[PDB]
Design an enzyme around this catalytic site. Structure first.
Site, PDB file in Angstrom:
ATOM      1  N   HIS A 120      70.882  53.525  34.637  1.00  0.00           N
ATOM      2  CA  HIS A 120      70.235  52.919  36.125  1.00  0.00           C
ATOM      3  C   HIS A 120      70.060  51.619  35.891  1.00  0.00           C
ATOM      4  O   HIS A 120      69.581  50.664  34.830  1.00  0.00           O
ATOM      5  CB  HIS A 120      68.813  53.569  36.166  1.00  0.00           C
ATOM      6  CG  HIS A 120      68.941  55.010  36.692  1.00  0.00           C
ATOM      7  ND1 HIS A 120      67.912  55.914  36.217  1.00  0.00           N
ATOM      8  CD2 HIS A 120      69.928  55.503  37.633  1.00  0.00           C
ATOM      9  CE1 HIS A 120      68.496  56.854  37.138  1.00  0.00           C
ATOM     10  NE2 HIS A 120      69.417  56.795  37.936  1.00  0.00           N
TER      11      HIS A 120
ATOM     12  N   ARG B  67      68.555  48.816  37.127  1.00  0.00           N
ATOM     13  CA  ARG B  67      67.378  47.851  36.936  1.00  0.00           C
ATOM     14  C   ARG B  67      66.506  48.178  35.782  1.00  0.00           C
ATOM     15  O   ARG B  67      65.559  47.463  35.373  1.00  0.00           O
ATOM     16  CB  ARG B  67      66.504  48.152  38.182  1.00  0.00           C
ATOM     17  CG  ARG B  67      66.032  49.507  38.146  1.00  0.00           C
ATOM     18  CD  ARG B  67      65.379  49.798  39.615  1.00  0.00           C
ATOM     19  NE  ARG B  67      64.906  51.291  39.937  1.00  0.00           N
ATOM     20  CZ  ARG B  67      64.629  51.558  41.016  1.00  0.00           C
ATOM     21  NH1 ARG B  67      64.656  50.845  42.204  1.00  0.00           N
ATOM     22  NH2 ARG B  67      64.250  52.775  41.382  1.00  0.00           N
ATOM     23  N   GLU B  68      67.048  49.086  35.014  1.00  0.00           N
ATOM     24  CA  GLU B  68      66.225  49.511  33.821  1.00  0.00           C
ATOM     25  C   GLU B  68      66.501  48.760  32.246  1.00  0.00           C
ATOM     26  O   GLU B  68      66.956  49.192  31.248  1.00  0.00           O
ATOM     27  CB  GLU B  68      66.226  51.110  33.593  1.00  0.00           C
ATOM     28  CG  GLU B  68      65.651  51.942  34.634  1.00  0.00           C
ATOM     29  CD  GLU B  68      66.185  53.398  34.609  1.00  0.00           C
ATOM     30  OE1 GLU B  68      65.868  53.928  35.681  1.00  0.00           O
ATOM     31  OE2 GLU B  68      66.715  53.837  33.694  1.00  0.00           O
TER      32      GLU B  68
ATOM     33  N   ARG C  42      72.258  61.801  39.139  1.00  0.00           N
ATOM     34  CA  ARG C  42      72.104  62.911  40.029  1.00  0.00           C
ATOM     35  C   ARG C  42      73.659  63.471  40.324  1.00  0.00           C
ATOM     36  O   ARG C  42      73.882  64.269  41.404  1.00  0.00           O
ATOM     37  CB  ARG C  42      71.506  62.179  41.672  1.00  0.00           C
ATOM     38  CG  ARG C  42      70.187  61.996  41.437  1.00  0.00           C
ATOM     39  CD  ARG C  42      69.242  63.111  41.091  1.00  0.00           C
ATOM     40  NE  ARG C  42      67.987  62.617  41.262  1.00  0.00           N
ATOM     41  CZ  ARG C  42      67.272  61.917  40.323  1.00  0.00           C
ATOM     42  NH1 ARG C  42      68.062  61.588  39.169  1.00  0.00           N
ATOM     43  NH2 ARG C  42      65.943  61.467  40.095  1.00  0.00           N
TER      44      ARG C  42
ATOM     45  N   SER D 202      64.110  53.731  31.561  1.00  0.00           N
ATOM     46  CA  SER D 202      62.750  53.390  31.841  1.00  0.00           C
ATOM     47  C   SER D 202      62.250  53.512  33.152  1.00  0.00           C
ATOM     48  O   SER D 202      63.271  53.615  34.056  1.00  0.00           O
ATOM     49  CB  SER D 202      62.407  51.711  31.232  1.00  0.00           C
ATOM     50  OG  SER D 202      63.113  50.789  32.175  1.00  0.00           O
ATOM     51  N   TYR D 203      60.996  53.440  33.644  1.00  0.00           N
ATOM     52  CA  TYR D 203      59.833  53.449  32.398  1.00  0.00           C
ATOM     53  C   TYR D 203      59.003  54.804  32.723  1.00  0.00           C
ATOM     54  O   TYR D 203      59.339  55.474  33.641  1.00  0.00           O
ATOM     55  CB  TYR D 203      58.913  52.158  32.859  1.00  0.00           C
ATOM     56  CG  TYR D 203      58.441  52.429  34.339  1.00  0.00           C
ATOM     57  CD1 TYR D 203      59.026  51.717  35.234  1.00  0.00           C
ATOM     58  CD2 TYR D 203      57.115  52.598  34.482  1.00  0.00           C
ATOM     59  CE1 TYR D 203      58.602  51.697  36.539  1.00  0.00           C
ATOM     60  CE2 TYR D 203      56.544  52.514  35.640  1.00  0.00           C
ATOM     61  CZ  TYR D 203      57.308  52.412  36.788  1.00  0.00           C
ATOM     62  OH  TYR D 203      56.738  52.083  38.000  1.00  0.00           O
TER      63      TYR D 203
ATOM     64  N   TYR E 163      59.100  65.263  37.153  1.00  0.00           N
ATOM     65  CA  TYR E 163      59.601  65.713  38.648  1.00  0.00           C
ATOM     66  C   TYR E 163      60.834  66.582  38.617  1.00  0.00           C
ATOM     67  O   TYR E 163      61.716  66.474  37.690  1.00  0.00           O
ATOM     68  CB  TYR E 163      59.791  64.700  39.485  1.00  0.00           C
ATOM     69  CG  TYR E 163      60.532  63.547  39.248  1.00  0.00           C
ATOM     70  CD1 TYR E 163      61.855  63.685  38.970  1.00  0.00           C
ATOM     71  CD2 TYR E 163      59.914  62.291  39.144  1.00  0.00           C
ATOM     72  CE1 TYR E 163      62.482  62.435  38.465  1.00  0.00           C
ATOM     73  CE2 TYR E 163      60.571  61.347  38.937  1.00  0.00           C
ATOM     74  CZ  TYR E 163      61.638  61.191  38.672  1.00  0.00           C
ATOM     75  OH  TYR E 163      62.489  59.960  38.340  1.00  0.00           O
TER      76      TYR E 163
ATOM     77  N   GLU F 136      62.121  57.673  28.172  1.00  0.00           N
ATOM     78  CA  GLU F 136      61.556  56.744  29.086  1.00  0.00           C
ATOM     79  C   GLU F 136      60.585  55.655  28.400  1.00  0.00           C
ATOM     80  O   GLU F 136      59.567  55.882  27.947  1.00  0.00           O
ATOM     81  CB  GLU F 136      60.764  57.563  30.186  1.00  0.00           C
ATOM     82  CG  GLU F 136      61.266  58.333  31.348  1.00  0.00           C
ATOM     83  CD  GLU F 136      62.486  57.585  32.281  1.00  0.00           C
ATOM     84  OE1 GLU F 136      62.038  56.278  32.325  1.00  0.00           O
ATOM     85  OE2 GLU F 136      63.159  58.015  33.067  1.00  0.00           O
TER      86      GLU F 136
HETATM   87  C1  LIG Z   1      57.167  55.815  37.107  1.00  0.00           C
HETATM   88  C2  LIG Z   1      58.381  55.328  37.712  1.00  0.00           C
HETATM   89  C3  LIG Z   1      59.748  55.471  37.176  1.00  0.00           C
HETATM   90  C4  LIG Z   1      60.258  56.946  36.615  1.00  0.00           C
HETATM   91  C5  LIG Z   1      61.557  57.058  36.066  1.00  0.00           C
HETATM   92  C6  LIG Z   1      62.673  56.685  36.913  1.00  0.00           C
HETATM   93  N1  LIG Z   1      62.447  57.248  38.175  1.00  0.00           N
HETATM   94  C7  LIG Z   1      62.893  56.364  39.165  1.00  0.00           C
HETATM   95  O1  LIG Z   1      63.144  55.312  39.237  1.00  0.00           O
HETATM   96  O2  LIG Z   1      62.780  57.216  40.449  1.00  0.00           O
HETATM   97  C8  LIG Z   1      63.238  56.486  41.640  1.00  0.00           C
HETATM   98  C9  LIG Z   1      62.836  57.060  42.926  1.00  0.00           C
HETATM   99  C10 LIG Z   1      62.496  58.523  43.010  1.00  0.00           C
HETATM  100  C11 LIG Z   1      62.564  58.838  44.137  1.00  0.00           C
HETATM  101  C12 LIG Z   1      62.817  58.267  45.582  1.00  0.00           C
HETATM  102  C13 LIG Z   1      63.321  56.962  45.219  1.00  0.00           C
HETATM  103  C14 LIG Z   1      63.413  56.283  44.136  1.00  0.00           C
HETATM  104  P1  LIG Z   1      64.295  57.255  35.955  1.00  0.00           P
HETATM  105  O3  LIG Z   1      64.406  56.582  34.880  1.00  0.00           O
HETATM  106  O4  LIG Z   1      65.206  56.928  37.291  1.00  0.00           O
HETATM  107  O5  LIG Z   1      64.109  58.785  35.677  1.00  0.00           O
HETATM  108  C15 LIG Z   1      65.096  59.706  35.577  1.00  0.00           C
HETATM  109  C16 LIG Z   1      65.895  60.097  36.687  1.00  0.00           C
HETATM  110  O6  LIG Z   1      65.218  59.961  37.869  1.00  0.00           O
HETATM  111  O7  LIG Z   1      67.200  60.095  36.786  1.00  0.00           O
HETATM  112  C17 LIG Z   1      64.721  60.971  34.846  1.00  0.00           C
HETATM  113  C18 LIG Z   1      63.437  60.800  34.283  1.00  0.00           C
HETATM  114  C19 LIG Z   1      63.065  62.031  33.456  1.00  0.00           C
HETATM  115  C20 LIG Z   1      64.182  63.001  33.204  1.00  0.00           C
HETATM  116  C21 LIG Z   1      65.196  62.943  33.786  1.00  0.00           C
HETATM  117  N2  LIG Z   1      66.399  63.974  33.752  1.00  0.00           N
HETATM  118  C22 LIG Z   1      66.724  64.638  34.799  1.00  0.00           C
HETATM  119  N3  LIG Z   1      67.602  65.623  34.709  1.00  0.00           N
HETATM  120  N4  LIG Z   1      66.332  64.357  36.148  1.00  0.00           N
HETATM  121  C23 LIG Z   1      65.802  62.061  34.496  1.00  0.00           C
HETATM  122 ZN   LIG Z   2      66.427  55.767  35.012  1.00  0.00          ZN
END
Ligand SMILES: CCCCC[C@H](NC(=O)OCc1ccccc1)P(=O)(O)O[C@H](C(=O)O)c1cccc(NC(=N)N)c1
Ligand SMILES: [Zn+2]
Length: 304
Positions: A64, A66-67, A140, A193-194, A244, A266
């Protein structure tokens, strides 16, 4: 120029992959596993003391855009490996016995975009038929309950799952590489992150992996180790209930390929700075994360 305690742009990271390899040919080899939508080279560094049929751990950063602390960590990890090999007993053992396949930036096109145009960009930068909206969420876009939950079918959305699994050149390249090296890859680690968490499968469903107890114990030990350095508190658990539900993630896909140790990290922080983590926290974040990654490596090595 490159700095390990600053965020570096792609041109600099690219030049770094060449330089660090050139300077450490006995510990690093560099290959390209494909091109991005916009034609940037997807580099993979094989870190380890070369030898015949070694097992491996695969780690990527920069899914991602921005991370930024994710990208910074893969670079930090590589320096730690080359600097301490021969001097620190664990890393020496690690590099002798296995390879780390380190993919420093997967989503290069998006990363460049966060430097040039929009610091908060998340997705790839591929075009989409029938709309002006750009990009697919790479986490995704994998064949893991693809697009069935926690994803959007709309290209204008931040969690767009794509036109099909592996529709993106970058995710296809990563999946192709892992599929071609399944016999050697024993763990898959993907850095984000994060939130300060270690997640394991599953996210695309509430079902639990058969080795769920082992993974919980491993993550529990890894977060304890991480905290020893600066007191940073991580939580951990299966993706679906810990953060989630969300389909099409690489951690779930890798696990279903038979890679029994699959973790999404994360990193810092918890939302004070969020994705815009200050460069002043790069070194401490990377140092404590190293402890967790090395603990996991040590465990995996003892379970080959
Ligand atoms: C507290 C805020 C940051 C939380 C972690 C990040 N999530 C995020 O940015 O979601 C953004 C978003 C979510 C919903 C709508 C619009 C934007 P991420 O690093 O993108 O999270 C991963 C993801 O969603 O792809 C992630 C986190 C944990 C487990 C997994 N694994 C998985 N198979 N989904 C994937
Ligand atoms: Zn991410």
């Amino acid at each position: 120029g490159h700095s390990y305690e600053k965020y570096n742009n792609w041109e600099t990271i690219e030049a770094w992959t060449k330089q660090v390899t050139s300077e450490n040919p006995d510990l690093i080899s560099r290959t390209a596993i494909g091109t991005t939508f916009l034609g940037n080279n997807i580099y993979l560094l094989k870190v380890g003391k070369p030898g015949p049929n070694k097992p491996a751990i695969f780690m990527d950063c920069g899914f991602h855009a921005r991370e930024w602390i994710s990208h910074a960590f893969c670079q930090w990890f590589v320096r730690e490996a080359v600097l301490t090999y021969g001097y620190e007993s664990h890393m020496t053992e690690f590099l002798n016995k296995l390879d780390f396949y380190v993919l420093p930036v997967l989503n290069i096109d998006g990363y460049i975009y966060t430097w040039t145009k929009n610091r908060m960009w998340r997705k790839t930068r591929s075009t989409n038929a029938g709309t002006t909206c750009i990009g697919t969420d790479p986490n995704r876009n994998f064949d893991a309950g693809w697009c069935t939950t926690g994803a959007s079918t709309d290209p204008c959305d931040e969690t767009y799952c794509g036109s099909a699994a592996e529709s993106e050149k970058e995710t296809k390249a990563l999946a192709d590489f892992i599929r071609n090296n399944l016999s050697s890859i024993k763990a898959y680690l993907t850095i984000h992150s994060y939130s300060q968490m270690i997640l394991y499968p599953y996210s695309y469903d509430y079902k639990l992996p058969e080795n769920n107890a082992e993974l919980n114990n491993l993550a529990k030990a890894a977060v304890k180790e991480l905290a020893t350095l600066y007191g940073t508190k991580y939580t951990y658990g299966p993706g679906a209930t810990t953060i989630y539900p969300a389909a099409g993630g690489s951690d779930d896909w890798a696990y279903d390929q038979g890679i029994k140790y699959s973790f999404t990290f994360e990193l810092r922080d918890k939302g004070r700075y969020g994705f815009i983590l200050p460069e002043s926290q790069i070194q401490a974040t990377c140092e404590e994360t190293m402890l967790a990654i090395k603990y996991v490596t040590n465990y995996v090595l003892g379970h080959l």
